[PDB]
Design a protein around this motif. Structure first.
Motif, short mmCIF file in Angstrom:
data_model
loop_
_atom_site.label_atom_id
_atom_site.label_comp_id
_atom_site.label_asym_id
_atom_site.label_seq_id
_atom_site.Cartn_x
_atom_site.Cartn_y
_atom_site.Cartn_z
N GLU A 48 0.61 -1.28 0.19
CA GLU A 48 0.11 -0.08 0.08
C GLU A 48 0.78 1.14 0.00
OE1 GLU A 48 -2.41 -0.38 3.51
OE2 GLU A 48 -4.00 -1.47 2.63
N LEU A 49 2.06 1.18 -0.02
CA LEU A 49 2.87 2.11 0.23
C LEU A 49 3.54 2.60 -1.10
CD1 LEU A 49 5.41 4.18 1.87
CD2 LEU A 49 6.33 1.95 2.25
N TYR A 50 4.18 3.74 -1.49
CA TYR A 50 4.83 4.28 -2.50
C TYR A 50 6.11 4.82 -2.29
CZ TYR A 50 0.33 4.07 -4.98
OH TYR A 50 -1.03 3.68 -5.35
N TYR A 51 7.10 4.98 -3.28
CA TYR A 51 8.35 5.48 -2.91
C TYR A 51 8.71 6.53 -3.84
CZ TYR A 51 9.23 1.47 0.07
OH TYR A 51 9.18 0.56 1.17
N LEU A 52 9.82 7.29 -3.36
CA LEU A 52 10.42 8.22 -4.33
C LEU A 52 12.00 8.25 -4.32
CD1 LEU A 52 8.20 11.25 -3.53
CD2 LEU A 52 8.09 9.88 -5.64
N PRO A 53 12.68 8.71 -5.10
CA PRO A 53 14.14 8.53 -5.06
C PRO A 53 14.58 9.52 -3.92
CG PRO A 53 13.53 10.09 -6.86
CD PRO A 53 12.15 9.38 -6.42
N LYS A 54 15.91 9.22 -3.57
CA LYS A 54 16.53 9.98 -2.35
C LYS A 54 16.75 11.45 -2.82
CE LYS A 54 20.36 9.68 0.74
NZ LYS A 54 21.75 9.09 1.06
N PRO A 55 16.37 12.53 -2.33
CA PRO A 55 16.96 13.70 -2.36
C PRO A 55 18.31 13.75 -2.10
CG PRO A 55 15.25 14.04 -0.89
CD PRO A 55 15.24 12.55 -1.46
N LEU A 56 19.26 14.33 -3.17
CA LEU A 56 20.70 14.56 -2.81
C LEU A 56 20.79 16.22 -2.05
CD1 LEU A 56 23.51 13.44 -3.45
CD2 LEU A 56 23.58 14.70 -5.55
N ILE A 57 20.28 16.00 -0.87
CA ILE A 57 20.40 17.38 0.07
C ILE A 57 21.39 17.16 0.96
CG2 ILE A 57 17.86 18.08 -0.35
CD1 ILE A 57 17.59 16.80 2.43
N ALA B 142 23.65 23.86 -7.55
CA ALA B 142 23.07 22.51 -8.08
C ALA B 142 23.78 21.47 -7.26
CB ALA B 142 23.06 22.38 -9.49
N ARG B 143 23.03 20.37 -6.96
CA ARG B 143 23.71 19.07 -6.42
C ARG B 143 22.93 18.19 -7.44
NH1 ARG B 143 26.09 19.88 -1.54
NH2 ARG B 143 25.54 21.59 -0.16
N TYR B 144 23.96 17.49 -8.28
CA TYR B 144 23.48 16.52 -9.31
C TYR B 144 24.72 15.66 -9.55
CZ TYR B 144 26.78 18.86 -12.41
OH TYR B 144 27.65 19.34 -13.12
N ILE B 145 24.09 14.48 -10.36
CA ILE B 145 25.16 13.44 -10.89
C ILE B 145 24.47 13.43 -12.13
CG2 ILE B 145 25.20 12.52 -8.50
CD1 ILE B 145 23.80 10.13 -9.69
N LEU B 146 25.72 13.33 -13.24
CA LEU B 146 25.53 13.10 -14.53
C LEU B 146 25.23 11.55 -14.81
CD1 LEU B 146 27.47 15.77 -16.37
CD2 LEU B 146 24.92 15.64 -16.07
N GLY C 277 17.50 12.55 -8.95
CA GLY C 277 17.34 13.12 -7.59
C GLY C 277 17.99 14.27 -7.14
N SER C 278 18.59 14.80 -8.37
CA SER C 278 19.23 16.26 -8.48
C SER C 278 18.46 17.24 -7.74
CB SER C 278 19.67 16.66 -9.94
OG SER C 278 18.73 17.06 -10.51
N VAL C 279 18.93 18.22 -7.10
CA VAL C 279 18.51 19.47 -6.51
C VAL C 279 18.81 20.61 -7.28
CG1 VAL C 279 18.01 20.69 -4.33
CG2 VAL C 279 18.23 18.19 -4.37
N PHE C 280 17.92 21.59 -7.57
CA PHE C 280 18.41 23.01 -8.23
C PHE C 280 17.78 23.96 -7.74
CE2 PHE C 280 18.57 19.71 -11.58
CZ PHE C 280 19.90 20.08 -12.21
N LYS C 281 18.24 25.06 -7.97
CA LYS C 281 17.72 26.40 -7.38
C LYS C 281 17.14 27.34 -8.49
CE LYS C 281 19.12 30.56 -4.85
NZ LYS C 281 20.29 31.31 -4.37
N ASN C 282 17.46 27.08 -9.75
CA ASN C 282 16.93 27.89 -10.99
C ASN C 282 16.03 26.87 -11.78
OD1 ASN C 282 18.36 29.77 -9.76
ND2 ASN C 282 19.82 30.22 -11.10
#
Length: 297
Positions: free
Chosen positions: A64-73, A232-236, A264-269
């Motif tokens: 009954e449970l859903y999942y999302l990718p881990k934020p890279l914060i 930005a925190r990201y991986i290519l 899972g990347s985090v952006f500001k713009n």
RNA sequence: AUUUAUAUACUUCGGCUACGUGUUC
């Protein structure tokens, strides 16, 4: 903005580099590719479903449970060990994670309870060689497949105007009988889908915050990437592979290498992506999907 | 015409999927 539930009941091969690799989820590139090829086979038009539709990556679910990718914060502790081993965060605890309310023991419990499938290798041979007539080695090869428990699967995030959503639903009705993975014609990868609404997922998807969590694989267009990478925190992730029916020789046709941010990347713009062309020496253009689907927190 | 009613021993011992062969063009 609906979600599409997927249950499989048959093993699926998804692939990274060879056939004997097994992978659990698939990216928006192969999803859009499957939608586009199904559309072309059905003979309807592609303009409607090219520059209006936004698709998020596939993510797994359980009973009954859903999942999302881990934020890279950047969580400021120092363990940095139990969290590195975590790959998906349940939706119930997502905002708890983004506010640093997840404890180490709770992380261990989540890692323990996260069983949503297992991996297998099936060995196969090919006697098409001289074996049928003269002394010739049978050639063994392996394929990597991944199976779910009877109460598991993958789900989507889609958004757009209602007409585009109706077209998408039609195409998925068609598509549930083609594959969504690798050896489609060898007995792998048929699914049943269902449309569901979730109150908690809806609230999460319509939140309001300062950061952004990328849920698809995108690349900024030429003129906006410069402002995109301010903080930005990201991986290519390199994405390559061959193409289906572009010229005479399959083994001579190979798509140009492409790079895109992960899921899972985090952006500001915030930026808007595009369906980049990755063709050359070809009769028809070949597309790759790079358009973001943000959640604002 | 008058008492037995099958009895004890042993209830299978000996001797324990090999080759072409796994990966690519």
């Amino acid at each position: 903005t609906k979600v599409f539930k997927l249950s499989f009941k048959t093993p699926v091969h998804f692939g990274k580099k060879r056939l004997s690799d097994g992978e659990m989820t698939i990216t928006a590139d192969t999803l859009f590719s499957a939608l586009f090829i199904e559309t072309l086979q059905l003979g309807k038009d592609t303009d409607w479903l090219l520059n209006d539709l936004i698709i998020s990556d596939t993510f797994p679910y359980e009973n009954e449970l859903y999942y999302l990718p881990k934020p890279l914060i950047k969580i400021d502790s120092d363990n940095h060990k139990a969290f590195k081993k975590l790959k998906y965060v349940p939706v119930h605890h997502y905002n708890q994670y983004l506010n640093g309310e997840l404890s180490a023991e709770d992380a261990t419990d989540l890692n323990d309870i996260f069983n949503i499938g297992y991996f297998s290798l099936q060995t196969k041979v090919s006697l098409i060689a001289q074996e049928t007539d003269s002394s010739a080695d049978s050639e063994p090869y392996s394929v990597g497949t991944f199976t779910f428990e009877p109460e598991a699967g993958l789900y989507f995030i889609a958004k757009g105007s209602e007409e585009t959503l109706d077209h998408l639903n039609n195409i998925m009705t068609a598509l549930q009988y083609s594959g969504l993975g690798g050896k489609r014609n060898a007995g792998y990868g048929q699914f049943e889908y269902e449309i569901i609404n979730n109150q908690q997922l809806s609230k999460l998807l319509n939140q309001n915050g300062k950061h952004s969590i990328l849920l698809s694989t995108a690349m900024a267009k030429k003129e906006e990437i410069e402002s995109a990478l301010k903080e930005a925190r990201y991986i290519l992730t390199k994405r390559s592979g061959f193409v289906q029916s572009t010229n005479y020789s399959e083994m001579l046709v190979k798509k140009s290498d492409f790079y895109s941010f992960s899921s899972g990347s985090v952006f500001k713009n915030i930026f808007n992506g595009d369906i980049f062309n990755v063709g050359h020496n070809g009769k028809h253009p070949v597309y790759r999907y790079a358009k973001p689907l943000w959640l604002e927190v």
